[PDB]
């Protein structure tokens, strides 16, 4: 997997440049949500189980 | 904007490598959704205004 850790902090959708969802595969046993922030092109994994994340996708 | 065409044809979840969601910006007025498949170098821009795409 690419995520060494995942953040539980809410992401401001206005600061989000891109969000990539990577389905659970053979290379990685869990779904990974990677957010690319506008700020400084900083990547950050989000919690696919968190509620703050479940909604984030809904909004978009 | 990178999606000049958007598809209404559902993607086989098994063939999906990843899905990218790009919210609207000052460079592109709409949200763009792109699925990258596992083979054939295939990518597909999906209709965000499609409930099916949310399936």
PDB file of N, CA and C in Angstrom:
ATOM      1  N   UNK A   1       0.861  -1.218   0.000  1.00  0.00           N
ATOM      2  CA  UNK A   1       0.000   0.000   0.000  1.00  0.00           C
ATOM      3  C   UNK A   1       0.879   1.245   0.000  1.00  0.00           C
ATOM      4  N   UNK A   2       0.314   2.380  -0.397  1.00  0.00           N
ATOM      5  CA  UNK A   2       1.083   3.618  -0.434  1.00  0.00           C
ATOM      6  C   UNK A   2       0.962   4.446   0.853  1.00  0.00           C
ATOM      7  N   UNK A   3      -0.111   4.232   1.608  1.00  0.00           N
ATOM      8  CA  UNK A   3      -0.331   4.983   2.846  1.00  0.00           C
ATOM      9  C   UNK A   3       0.392   4.403   4.063  1.00  0.00           C
ATOM     10  N   UNK A   4       1.382   5.134   4.570  1.00  0.00           N
ATOM     11  CA  UNK A   4       2.135   4.702   5.749  1.00  0.00           C
ATOM     12  C   UNK A   4       1.260   4.983   6.971  1.00  0.00           C
ATOM     13  N   UNK A   5       0.372   5.954   6.817  1.00  0.00           N
ATOM     14  CA  UNK A   5      -0.550   6.334   7.877  1.00  0.00           C
ATOM     15  C   UNK A   5      -1.712   7.071   7.240  1.00  0.00           C
ATOM     16  N   UNK A   6      -2.828   7.160   7.950  1.00  0.00           N
ATOM     17  CA  UNK A   6      -3.979   7.879   7.433  1.00  0.00           C
ATOM     18  C   UNK A   6      -4.401   8.930   8.441  1.00  0.00           C
ATOM     19  N   UNK A   7      -4.844  10.070   7.928  1.00  0.00           N
ATOM     20  CA  UNK A   7      -5.274  11.174   8.760  1.00  0.00           C
ATOM     21  C   UNK A   7      -6.758  11.106   9.061  1.00  0.00           C
ATOM     22  N   UNK A   8      -7.115  11.525  10.271  1.00  0.00           N
ATOM     23  CA  UNK A   8      -8.501  11.550  10.715  1.00  0.00           C
ATOM     24  C   UNK A   8      -8.986  12.997  10.767  1.00  0.00           C
ATOM     25  N   UNK A   9      -8.132  13.924  10.347  1.00  0.00           N
ATOM     26  CA  UNK A   9      -8.493  15.337  10.348  1.00  0.00           C
ATOM     27  C   UNK A   9      -9.322  15.707   9.123  1.00  0.00           C
ATOM     28  N   UNK A  10     -10.416  16.456   9.334  1.00  0.00           N
ATOM     29  CA  UNK A  10     -11.304  16.882   8.246  1.00  0.00           C
ATOM     30  C   UNK A  10     -10.570  17.720   7.208  1.00  0.00           C
ATOM     31  N   UNK A  11     -10.847  17.452   5.938  1.00  0.00           N
ATOM     32  CA  UNK A  11     -10.221  18.184   4.846  1.00  0.00           C
ATOM     33  C   UNK A  11     -11.211  19.201   4.289  1.00  0.00           C
ATOM     34  N   UNK A  12     -10.783  20.455   4.184  1.00  0.00           N
ATOM     35  CA  UNK A  12     -11.646  21.498   3.639  1.00  0.00           C
ATOM     36  C   UNK A  12     -11.746  21.287   2.131  1.00  0.00           C
ATOM     37  N   UNK A  13     -12.918  20.844   1.647  1.00  0.00           N
ATOM     38  CA  UNK A  13     -13.142  20.594   0.218  1.00  0.00           C
ATOM     39  C   UNK A  13     -12.661  21.698  -0.720  1.00  0.00           C
ATOM     40  N   UNK A  14     -12.496  22.904  -0.186  1.00  0.00           N
ATOM     41  CA  UNK A  14     -12.036  24.025  -0.994  1.00  0.00           C
ATOM     42  C   UNK A  14     -10.518  23.998  -1.111  1.00  0.00           C
ATOM     43  N   UNK A  15      -9.880  23.207  -0.254  1.00  0.00           N
ATOM     44  CA  UNK A  15      -8.427  23.083  -0.265  1.00  0.00           C
ATOM     45  C   UNK A  15      -8.025  21.826  -1.028  1.00  0.00           C
ATOM     46  N   UNK A  16      -9.018  20.988  -1.318  1.00  0.00           N
ATOM     47  CA  UNK A  16      -8.801  19.742  -2.048  1.00  0.00           C
ATOM     48  C   UNK A  16      -8.638  19.982  -3.542  1.00  0.00           C
ATOM     49  N   UNK A  17      -7.506  19.552  -4.086  1.00  0.00           N
ATOM     50  CA  UNK A  17      -7.243  19.700  -5.509  1.00  0.00           C
ATOM     51  C   UNK A  17      -7.735  18.445  -6.224  1.00  0.00           C
ATOM     52  N   UNK A  18      -7.494  17.293  -5.604  1.00  0.00           N
ATOM     53  CA  UNK A  18      -7.897  16.014  -6.173  1.00  0.00           C
ATOM     54  C   UNK A  18      -8.020  14.932  -5.108  1.00  0.00           C
ATOM     55  N   UNK A  19      -8.891  13.964  -5.360  1.00  0.00           N
ATOM     56  CA  UNK A  19      -9.082  12.854  -4.442  1.00  0.00           C
ATOM     57  C   UNK A  19      -9.032  11.568  -5.262  1.00  0.00           C
ATOM     58  N   UNK A  20      -8.162  10.645  -4.876  1.00  0.00           N
ATOM     59  CA  UNK A  20      -8.093   9.379  -5.593  1.00  0.00           C
ATOM     60  C   UNK A  20      -8.443   8.208  -4.692  1.00  0.00           C
ATOM     61  N   UNK A  21      -9.359   7.388  -5.190  1.00  0.00           N
ATOM     62  CA  UNK A  21      -9.820   6.220  -4.478  1.00  0.00           C
ATOM     63  C   UNK A  21      -9.208   5.016  -5.160  1.00  0.00           C
ATOM     64  N   UNK A  22      -8.476   4.233  -4.385  1.00  0.00           N
ATOM     65  CA  UNK A  22      -7.815   3.047  -4.897  1.00  0.00           C
ATOM     66  C   UNK A  22      -8.419   1.809  -4.249  1.00  0.00           C
ATOM     67  N   UNK A  23      -9.268   1.096  -5.005  1.00  0.00           N
ATOM     68  CA  UNK A  23      -9.934  -0.117  -4.531  1.00  0.00           C
ATOM     69  C   UNK A  23      -8.964  -1.137  -3.954  1.00  0.00           C
ATOM     70  N   UNK A  24      -9.462  -1.951  -3.031  1.00  0.00           N
ATOM     71  CA  UNK A  24      -8.642  -2.983  -2.413  1.00  0.00           C
ATOM     72  C   UNK A  24      -8.192  -3.940  -3.506  1.00  0.00           C
ATOM     73  N   UNK A  25      -6.896  -4.219  -3.556  1.00  0.00           N
ATOM     74  CA  UNK A  25      -6.370  -5.121  -4.570  1.00  0.00           C
ATOM     75  C   UNK A  25      -5.528  -6.241  -3.971  1.00  0.00           C
ATOM     76  N   UNK A  26      -4.586  -6.728  -4.770  1.00  0.00           N
ATOM     77  CA  UNK A  26      -3.684  -7.790  -4.356  1.00  0.00           C
ATOM     78  C   UNK A  26      -2.432  -7.133  -3.792  1.00  0.00           C
ATOM     79  N   UNK A  27      -2.104  -5.963  -4.329  1.00  0.00           N
ATOM     80  CA  UNK A  27      -0.939  -5.204  -3.886  1.00  0.00           C
ATOM     81  C   UNK A  27      -1.217  -4.600  -2.502  1.00  0.00           C
ATOM     82  N   UNK A  28      -2.481  -4.256  -2.260  1.00  0.00           N
ATOM     83  CA  UNK A  28      -2.914  -3.667  -0.993  1.00  0.00           C
ATOM     84  C   UNK A  28      -4.265  -4.249  -0.568  1.00  0.00           C
ATOM     85  N   UNK A  29      -4.365  -4.752   0.676  1.00  0.00           N
ATOM     86  CA  UNK A  29      -5.591  -5.349   1.221  1.00  0.00           C
ATOM     87  C   UNK A  29      -6.749  -4.423   1.597  1.00  0.00           C
ATOM     88  N   UNK A  30      -6.551  -3.114   1.495  1.00  0.00           N
ATOM     89  CA  UNK A  30      -7.618  -2.180   1.850  1.00  0.00           C
ATOM     90  C   UNK A  30      -7.744  -1.034   0.859  1.00  0.00           C
ATOM     91  N   UNK A  31      -8.918  -0.413   0.838  1.00  0.00           N
ATOM     92  CA  UNK A  31      -9.162   0.713  -0.048  1.00  0.00           C
ATOM     93  C   UNK A  31      -8.408   1.910   0.512  1.00  0.00           C
ATOM     94  N   UNK A  32      -7.704   2.619  -0.358  1.00  0.00           N
ATOM     95  CA  UNK A  32      -6.958   3.790   0.073  1.00  0.00           C
ATOM     96  C   UNK A  32      -7.541   5.040  -0.568  1.00  0.00           C
ATOM     97  N   UNK A  33      -7.712   6.083   0.243  1.00  0.00           N
ATOM     98  CA  UNK A  33      -8.235   7.362  -0.217  1.00  0.00           C
ATOM     99  C   UNK A  33      -7.088   8.349  -0.055  1.00  0.00           C
ATOM    100  N   UNK A  34      -6.587   8.862  -1.171  1.00  0.00           N
ATOM    101  CA  UNK A  34      -5.477   9.803  -1.133  1.00  0.00           C
ATOM    102  C   UNK A  34      -5.916  11.170  -1.613  1.00  0.00           C
ATOM    103  N   UNK A  35      -5.757  12.165  -0.751  1.00  0.00           N
ATOM    104  CA  UNK A  35      -6.147  13.516  -1.109  1.00  0.00           C
ATOM    105  C   UNK A  35      -4.930  14.359  -1.467  1.00  0.00           C
ATOM    106  N   UNK A  36      -5.024  15.070  -2.585  1.00  0.00           N
ATOM    107  CA  UNK A  36      -3.961  15.965  -3.022  1.00  0.00           C
ATOM    108  C   UNK A  36      -4.496  17.358  -2.726  1.00  0.00           C
ATOM    109  N   UNK A  37      -3.855  18.050  -1.793  1.00  0.00           N
ATOM    110  CA  UNK A  37      -4.288  19.385  -1.401  1.00  0.00           C
ATOM    111  C   UNK A  37      -3.728  20.466  -2.322  1.00  0.00           C
ATOM    112  N   UNK A  38      -4.497  21.535  -2.505  1.00  0.00           N
ATOM    113  CA  UNK A  38      -4.052  22.645  -3.339  1.00  0.00           C
ATOM    114  C   UNK A  38      -2.814  23.224  -2.657  1.00  0.00           C
ATOM    115  N   UNK A  39      -2.992  23.642  -1.406  1.00  0.00           N
ATOM    116  CA  UNK A  39      -1.926  24.214  -0.582  1.00  0.00           C
ATOM    117  C   UNK A  39      -0.548  24.149  -1.230  1.00  0.00           C
ATOM    118  N   UNK A  40       0.135  23.026  -1.030  1.00  0.00           N
ATOM    119  CA  UNK A  40       1.471  22.823  -1.581  1.00  0.00           C
ATOM    120  C   UNK A  40       1.569  21.443  -2.232  1.00  0.00           C
ATOM    121  N   UNK A  41       0.504  21.045  -2.925  1.00  0.00           N
ATOM    122  CA  UNK A  41       0.481  19.750  -3.587  1.00  0.00           C
ATOM    123  C   UNK A  41       0.784  18.606  -2.636  1.00  0.00           C
ATOM    124  N   UNK A  42       0.501  18.826  -1.355  1.00  0.00           N
ATOM    125  CA  UNK A  42       0.748  17.833  -0.315  1.00  0.00           C
ATOM    126  C   UNK A  42      -0.264  16.694  -0.333  1.00  0.00           C
ATOM    127  N   UNK A  43       0.243  15.466  -0.341  1.00  0.00           N
ATOM    128  CA  UNK A  43      -0.614  14.291  -0.343  1.00  0.00           C
ATOM    129  C   UNK A  43      -0.966  13.925   1.096  1.00  0.00           C
ATOM    130  N   UNK A  44      -2.120  13.295   1.272  1.00  0.00           N
ATOM    131  CA  UNK A  44      -2.566  12.895   2.594  1.00  0.00           C
ATOM    132  C   UNK A  44      -3.635  11.827   2.464  1.00  0.00           C
ATOM    133  N   UNK A  45      -3.446  10.704   3.143  1.00  0.00           N
ATOM    134  CA  UNK A  45      -4.434   9.639   3.083  1.00  0.00           C
ATOM    135  C   UNK A  45      -5.559   9.931   4.060  1.00  0.00           C
ATOM    136  N   UNK A  46      -6.782   9.626   3.647  1.00  0.00           N
ATOM    137  CA  UNK A  46      -7.962   9.852   4.474  1.00  0.00           C
ATOM    138  C   UNK A  46      -8.529   8.510   4.924  1.00  0.00           C
ATOM    139  N   UNK A  47      -9.314   8.515   5.994  1.00  0.00           N
ATOM    140  CA  UNK A  47      -9.880   7.279   6.522  1.00  0.00           C
ATOM    141  C   UNK A  47     -11.163   6.865   5.803  1.00  0.00           C
ATOM    142  N   UNK A  48     -11.112   5.774   5.013  1.00  0.00           N
ATOM    143  CA  UNK A  48     -12.293   5.297   4.281  1.00  0.00           C
ATOM    144  C   UNK A  48     -13.447   4.882   5.196  1.00  0.00           C
ATOM    145  N   UNK A  49     -13.148   4.713   6.481  1.00  0.00           N
ATOM    146  CA  UNK A  49     -14.150   4.324   7.470  1.00  0.00           C
ATOM    147  C   UNK A  49     -14.714   5.541   8.196  1.00  0.00           C
ATOM    148  N   UNK A  50     -13.896   6.582   8.330  1.00  0.00           N
ATOM    149  CA  UNK A  50     -14.310   7.807   9.006  1.00  0.00           C
ATOM    150  C   UNK A  50     -15.597   8.356   8.403  1.00  0.00           C
ATOM    151  N   UNK A  51     -16.368   9.070   9.218  1.00  0.00           N
ATOM    152  CA  UNK A  51     -17.626   9.655   8.762  1.00  0.00           C
ATOM    153  C   UNK A  51     -17.336  10.940   7.994  1.00  0.00           C
ATOM    154  N   UNK A  52     -16.315  11.665   8.440  1.00  0.00           N
ATOM    155  CA  UNK A  52     -15.916  12.912   7.798  1.00  0.00           C
ATOM    156  C   UNK A  52     -15.531  12.643   6.345  1.00  0.00           C
ATOM    157  N   UNK A  53     -15.026  11.440   6.088  1.00  0.00           N
ATOM    158  CA  UNK A  53     -14.616  11.044   4.745  1.00  0.00           C
ATOM    159  C   UNK A  53     -15.810  10.554   3.933  1.00  0.00           C
ATOM    160  N   UNK A  54     -16.638   9.714   4.546  1.00  0.00           N
ATOM    161  CA  UNK A  54     -17.820   9.179   3.878  1.00  0.00           C
ATOM    162  C   UNK A  54     -18.666  10.298   3.279  1.00  0.00           C
ATOM    163  N   UNK A  55     -18.756  11.418   3.993  1.00  0.00           N
ATOM    164  CA  UNK A  55     -19.537  12.562   3.532  1.00  0.00           C
ATOM    165  C   UNK A  55     -18.789  13.369   2.477  1.00  0.00           C
ATOM    166  N   UNK A  56     -17.493  13.577   2.697  1.00  0.00           N
ATOM    167  CA  UNK A  56     -16.664  14.332   1.761  1.00  0.00           C
ATOM    168  C   UNK A  56     -16.931  13.911   0.315  1.00  0.00           C
ATOM    169  N   UNK A  57     -16.990  12.603   0.082  1.00  0.00           N
ATOM    170  CA  UNK A  57     -17.250  12.079  -1.255  1.00  0.00           C
ATOM    171  C   UNK A  57     -18.672  12.420  -1.681  1.00  0.00           C
ATOM    172  N   UNK A  58     -19.596  12.361  -0.727  1.00  0.00           N
ATOM    173  CA  UNK A  58     -21.000  12.664  -0.987  1.00  0.00           C
ATOM    174  C   UNK A  58     -21.143  14.072  -1.554  1.00  0.00           C
ATOM    175  N   UNK A  59     -20.568  15.045  -0.851  1.00  0.00           N
ATOM    176  CA  UNK A  59     -20.628  16.439  -1.272  1.00  0.00           C
ATOM    177  C   UNK A  59     -20.263  16.576  -2.747  1.00  0.00           C
ATOM    178  N   UNK A  60     -19.194  15.899  -3.155  1.00  0.00           N
ATOM    179  CA  UNK A  60     -18.744  15.953  -4.541  1.00  0.00           C
ATOM    180  C   UNK A  60     -19.473  14.933  -5.415  1.00  0.00           C
TER     181      UNK A  60
ATOM    182  N   UNK B   1     -10.016  22.009 -18.024  1.00  0.00           N
ATOM    183  CA  UNK B   1     -10.811  20.746 -17.961  1.00  0.00           C
ATOM    184  C   UNK B   1     -10.095  19.681 -18.789  1.00  0.00           C
ATOM    185  N   UNK B   2     -10.141  18.436 -18.342  1.00  0.00           N
ATOM    186  CA  UNK B   2      -9.464  17.382 -19.081  1.00  0.00           C
ATOM    187  C   UNK B   2     -10.443  16.449 -19.786  1.00  0.00           C
ATOM    188  N   UNK B   3     -11.693  16.475 -19.351  1.00  0.00           N
ATOM    189  CA  UNK B   3     -12.705  15.615 -19.936  1.00  0.00           C
ATOM    190  C   UNK B   3     -13.547  16.349 -20.971  1.00  0.00           C
ATOM    191  N   UNK B   4     -13.258  16.062 -22.233  1.00  0.00           N
ATOM    192  CA  UNK B   4     -13.949  16.673 -23.353  1.00  0.00           C
ATOM    193  C   UNK B   4     -15.236  15.896 -23.638  1.00  0.00           C
ATOM    194  N   UNK B   5     -15.248  14.654 -23.179  1.00  0.00           N
ATOM    195  CA  UNK B   5     -16.379  13.756 -23.323  1.00  0.00           C
ATOM    196  C   UNK B   5     -16.549  13.030 -22.004  1.00  0.00           C
ATOM    197  N   UNK B   6     -17.793  12.746 -21.649  1.00  0.00           N
ATOM    198  CA  UNK B   6     -18.082  12.055 -20.412  1.00  0.00           C
ATOM    199  C   UNK B   6     -18.950  10.849 -20.745  1.00  0.00           C
ATOM    200  N   UNK B   7     -18.638   9.705 -20.142  1.00  0.00           N
ATOM    201  CA  UNK B   7     -19.376   8.474 -20.410  1.00  0.00           C
ATOM    202  C   UNK B   7     -20.466   8.133 -19.401  1.00  0.00           C
ATOM    203  N   UNK B   8     -21.546   7.546 -19.907  1.00  0.00           N
ATOM    204  CA  UNK B   8     -22.662   7.128 -19.073  1.00  0.00           C
ATOM    205  C   UNK B   8     -22.615   5.615 -18.895  1.00  0.00           C
ATOM    206  N   UNK B   9     -21.638   4.976 -19.529  1.00  0.00           N
ATOM    207  CA  UNK B   9     -21.501   3.530 -19.425  1.00  0.00           C
ATOM    208  C   UNK B   9     -20.742   3.139 -18.160  1.00  0.00           C
ATOM    209  N   UNK B  10     -21.392   2.353 -17.286  1.00  0.00           N
ATOM    210  CA  UNK B  10     -20.830   1.877 -16.020  1.00  0.00           C
ATOM    211  C   UNK B  10     -19.517   1.131 -16.190  1.00  0.00           C
ATOM    212  N   UNK B  11     -18.658   1.248 -15.187  1.00  0.00           N
ATOM    213  CA  UNK B  11     -17.365   0.592 -15.210  1.00  0.00           C
ATOM    214  C   UNK B  11     -17.411  -0.706 -14.417  1.00  0.00           C
ATOM    215  N   UNK B  12     -16.698  -1.715 -14.902  1.00  0.00           N
ATOM    216  CA  UNK B  12     -16.643  -2.983 -14.197  1.00  0.00           C
ATOM    217  C   UNK B  12     -15.730  -2.742 -12.996  1.00  0.00           C
ATOM    218  N   UNK B  13     -16.309  -2.660 -11.787  1.00  0.00           N
ATOM    219  CA  UNK B  13     -15.529  -2.423 -10.567  1.00  0.00           C
ATOM    220  C   UNK B  13     -14.270  -3.270 -10.429  1.00  0.00           C
ATOM    221  N   UNK B  14     -14.253  -4.432 -11.074  1.00  0.00           N
ATOM    222  CA  UNK B  14     -13.094  -5.316 -11.004  1.00  0.00           C
ATOM    223  C   UNK B  14     -11.968  -4.811 -11.904  1.00  0.00           C
ATOM    224  N   UNK B  15     -12.335  -4.098 -12.962  1.00  0.00           N
ATOM    225  CA  UNK B  15     -11.352  -3.576 -13.905  1.00  0.00           C
ATOM    226  C   UNK B  15     -10.803  -2.224 -13.460  1.00  0.00           C
ATOM    227  N   UNK B  16     -11.372  -1.689 -12.384  1.00  0.00           N
ATOM    228  CA  UNK B  16     -10.977  -0.388 -11.852  1.00  0.00           C
ATOM    229  C   UNK B  16      -9.686  -0.426 -11.035  1.00  0.00           C
ATOM    230  N   UNK B  17      -8.703   0.359 -11.466  1.00  0.00           N
ATOM    231  CA  UNK B  17      -7.426   0.447 -10.769  1.00  0.00           C
ATOM    232  C   UNK B  17      -7.596   1.569  -9.742  1.00  0.00           C
ATOM    233  N   UNK B  18      -8.175   2.678 -10.189  1.00  0.00           N
ATOM    234  CA  UNK B  18      -8.423   3.814  -9.314  1.00  0.00           C
ATOM    235  C   UNK B  18      -9.391   4.790  -9.953  1.00  0.00           C
ATOM    236  N   UNK B  19      -9.981   5.615  -9.103  1.00  0.00           N
ATOM    237  CA  UNK B  19     -10.943   6.619  -9.503  1.00  0.00           C
ATOM    238  C   UNK B  19     -10.422   7.954  -8.967  1.00  0.00           C
ATOM    239  N   UNK B  20     -10.372   8.971  -9.821  1.00  0.00           N
ATOM    240  CA  UNK B  20      -9.926  10.295  -9.406  1.00  0.00           C
ATOM    241  C   UNK B  20     -11.101  11.254  -9.486  1.00  0.00           C
ATOM    242  N   UNK B  21     -11.269  12.038  -8.430  1.00  0.00           N
ATOM    243  CA  UNK B  21     -12.339  13.014  -8.382  1.00  0.00           C
ATOM    244  C   UNK B  21     -11.661  14.365  -8.255  1.00  0.00           C
ATOM    245  N   UNK B  22     -11.914  15.235  -9.227  1.00  0.00           N
ATOM    246  CA  UNK B  22     -11.309  16.555  -9.259  1.00  0.00           C
ATOM    247  C   UNK B  22     -12.359  17.651  -9.161  1.00  0.00           C
ATOM    248  N   UNK B  23     -12.541  18.222  -7.962  1.00  0.00           N
ATOM    249  CA  UNK B  23     -13.548  19.278  -7.836  1.00  0.00           C
ATOM    250  C   UNK B  23     -13.312  20.476  -8.740  1.00  0.00           C
ATOM    251  N   UNK B  24     -14.399  21.172  -9.056  1.00  0.00           N
ATOM    252  CA  UNK B  24     -14.350  22.360  -9.900  1.00  0.00           C
ATOM    253  C   UNK B  24     -13.330  23.359  -9.360  1.00  0.00           C
ATOM    254  N   UNK B  25     -12.729  24.121 -10.263  1.00  0.00           N
ATOM    255  CA  UNK B  25     -11.750  25.121  -9.878  1.00  0.00           C
ATOM    256  C   UNK B  25     -11.897  26.311 -10.813  1.00  0.00           C
ATOM    257  N   UNK B  26     -10.984  27.266 -10.701  1.00  0.00           N
ATOM    258  CA  UNK B  26     -11.033  28.444 -11.552  1.00  0.00           C
ATOM    259  C   UNK B  26     -10.512  28.081 -12.935  1.00  0.00           C
ATOM    260  N   UNK B  27     -10.059  26.838 -13.078  1.00  0.00           N
ATOM    261  CA  UNK B  27      -9.543  26.359 -14.353  1.00  0.00           C
ATOM    262  C   UNK B  27     -10.564  25.448 -15.045  1.00  0.00           C
ATOM    263  N   UNK B  28     -11.442  24.834 -14.258  1.00  0.00           N
ATOM    264  CA  UNK B  28     -12.481  23.966 -14.809  1.00  0.00           C
ATOM    265  C   UNK B  28     -13.732  24.097 -13.939  1.00  0.00           C
ATOM    266  N   UNK B  29     -14.820  24.652 -14.507  1.00  0.00           N
ATOM    267  CA  UNK B  29     -16.099  24.871 -13.821  1.00  0.00           C
ATOM    268  C   UNK B  29     -16.887  23.663 -13.337  1.00  0.00           C
ATOM    269  N   UNK B  30     -16.461  22.462 -13.705  1.00  0.00           N
ATOM    270  CA  UNK B  30     -17.180  21.282 -13.252  1.00  0.00           C
ATOM    271  C   UNK B  30     -16.262  20.248 -12.618  1.00  0.00           C
ATOM    272  N   UNK B  31     -16.860  19.347 -11.849  1.00  0.00           N
ATOM    273  CA  UNK B  31     -16.129  18.278 -11.198  1.00  0.00           C
ATOM    274  C   UNK B  31     -15.840  17.269 -12.307  1.00  0.00           C
ATOM    275  N   UNK B  32     -14.622  16.746 -12.342  1.00  0.00           N
ATOM    276  CA  UNK B  32     -14.274  15.747 -13.347  1.00  0.00           C
ATOM    277  C   UNK B  32     -13.948  14.452 -12.629  1.00  0.00           C
ATOM    278  N   UNK B  33     -14.476  13.347 -13.148  1.00  0.00           N
ATOM    279  CA  UNK B  33     -14.259  12.037 -12.546  1.00  0.00           C
ATOM    280  C   UNK B  33     -13.624  11.132 -13.582  1.00  0.00           C
ATOM    281  N   UNK B  34     -12.485  10.548 -13.232  1.00  0.00           N
ATOM    282  CA  UNK B  34     -11.760   9.694 -14.163  1.00  0.00           C
ATOM    283  C   UNK B  34     -11.411   8.342 -13.591  1.00  0.00           C
ATOM    284  N   UNK B  35     -11.849   7.294 -14.279  1.00  0.00           N
ATOM    285  CA  UNK B  35     -11.539   5.966 -13.812  1.00  0.00           C
ATOM    286  C   UNK B  35     -10.352   5.451 -14.608  1.00  0.00           C
ATOM    287  N   UNK B  36      -9.382   4.856 -13.925  1.00  0.00           N
ATOM    288  CA  UNK B  36      -8.238   4.275 -14.614  1.00  0.00           C
ATOM    289  C   UNK B  36      -8.388   2.770 -14.465  1.00  0.00           C
ATOM    290  N   UNK B  37      -8.407   2.076 -15.602  1.00  0.00           N
ATOM    291  CA  UNK B  37      -8.563   0.622 -15.642  1.00  0.00           C
ATOM    292  C   UNK B  37      -7.231  -0.074 -15.424  1.00  0.00           C
ATOM    293  N   UNK B  38      -7.289  -1.382 -15.184  1.00  0.00           N
ATOM    294  CA  UNK B  38      -6.085  -2.168 -14.941  1.00  0.00           C
ATOM    295  C   UNK B  38      -5.360  -2.529 -16.228  1.00  0.00           C
ATOM    296  N   UNK B  39      -6.085  -2.569 -17.337  1.00  0.00           N
ATOM    297  CA  UNK B  39      -5.446  -2.960 -18.591  1.00  0.00           C
ATOM    298  C   UNK B  39      -5.812  -2.121 -19.796  1.00  0.00           C
ATOM    299  N   UNK B  40      -5.089  -2.356 -20.888  1.00  0.00           N
ATOM    300  CA  UNK B  40      -5.307  -1.675 -22.159  1.00  0.00           C
ATOM    301  C   UNK B  40      -5.062  -0.163 -22.148  1.00  0.00           C
ATOM    302  N   UNK B  41      -4.414   0.333 -21.103  1.00  0.00           N
ATOM    303  CA  UNK B  41      -4.151   1.763 -21.016  1.00  0.00           C
ATOM    304  C   UNK B  41      -5.436   2.570 -20.993  1.00  0.00           C
ATOM    305  N   UNK B  42      -6.551   1.904 -20.701  1.00  0.00           N
ATOM    306  CA  UNK B  42      -7.850   2.563 -20.693  1.00  0.00           C
ATOM    307  C   UNK B  42      -8.144   3.439 -19.484  1.00  0.00           C
ATOM    308  N   UNK B  43      -8.732   4.593 -19.771  1.00  0.00           N
ATOM    309  CA  UNK B  43      -9.171   5.560 -18.774  1.00  0.00           C
ATOM    310  C   UNK B  43     -10.542   5.980 -19.274  1.00  0.00           C
ATOM    311  N   UNK B  44     -11.398   6.415 -18.367  1.00  0.00           N
ATOM    312  CA  UNK B  44     -12.707   6.812 -18.789  1.00  0.00           C
ATOM    313  C   UNK B  44     -13.227   7.913 -17.889  1.00  0.00           C
ATOM    314  N   UNK B  45     -13.625   9.013 -18.508  1.00  0.00           N
ATOM    315  CA  UNK B  45     -14.191  10.157 -17.807  1.00  0.00           C
ATOM    316  C   UNK B  45     -15.648   9.755 -17.571  1.00  0.00           C
ATOM    317  N   UNK B  46     -16.109   9.867 -16.333  1.00  0.00           N
ATOM    318  CA  UNK B  46     -17.467   9.481 -15.975  1.00  0.00           C
ATOM    319  C   UNK B  46     -18.377  10.665 -15.679  1.00  0.00           C
ATOM    320  N   UNK B  47     -19.679  10.443 -15.854  1.00  0.00           N
ATOM    321  CA  UNK B  47     -20.675  11.480 -15.614  1.00  0.00           C
ATOM    322  C   UNK B  47     -20.897  11.649 -14.118  1.00  0.00           C
ATOM    323  N   UNK B  48     -20.519  12.811 -13.571  1.00  0.00           N
ATOM    324  CA  UNK B  48     -20.707  13.041 -12.137  1.00  0.00           C
ATOM    325  C   UNK B  48     -22.187  13.235 -11.823  1.00  0.00           C
ATOM    326  N   UNK B  49     -22.935  13.682 -12.828  1.00  0.00           N
ATOM    327  CA  UNK B  49     -24.368  13.911 -12.683  1.00  0.00           C
ATOM    328  C   UNK B  49     -25.095  12.610 -12.986  1.00  0.00           C
ATOM    329  N   UNK B  50     -24.450  11.503 -12.638  1.00  0.00           N
ATOM    330  CA  UNK B  50     -25.009  10.178 -12.853  1.00  0.00           C
ATOM    331  C   UNK B  50     -24.970   9.395 -11.548  1.00  0.00           C
ATOM    332  N   UNK B  51     -26.146   9.060 -11.028  1.00  0.00           N
ATOM    333  CA  UNK B  51     -26.238   8.306  -9.784  1.00  0.00           C
ATOM    334  C   UNK B  51     -25.533   6.964  -9.955  1.00  0.00           C
ATOM    335  N   UNK B  52     -25.626   6.408 -11.160  1.00  0.00           N
ATOM    336  CA  UNK B  52     -25.005   5.126 -11.478  1.00  0.00           C
ATOM    337  C   UNK B  52     -23.498   5.169 -11.247  1.00  0.00           C
ATOM    338  N   UNK B  53     -22.890   6.314 -11.540  1.00  0.00           N
ATOM    339  CA  UNK B  53     -21.455   6.479 -11.351  1.00  0.00           C
ATOM    340  C   UNK B  53     -21.128   6.408  -9.861  1.00  0.00           C
ATOM    341  N   UNK B  54     -22.129   6.682  -9.030  1.00  0.00           N
ATOM    342  CA  UNK B  54     -21.956   6.641  -7.584  1.00  0.00           C
ATOM    343  C   UNK B  54     -22.158   5.211  -7.087  1.00  0.00           C
ATOM    344  N   UNK B  55     -22.527   4.326  -8.009  1.00  0.00           N
ATOM    345  CA  UNK B  55     -22.736   2.920  -7.691  1.00  0.00           C
ATOM    346  C   UNK B  55     -21.383   2.224  -7.611  1.00  0.00           C
TER     347      UNK B  55
END
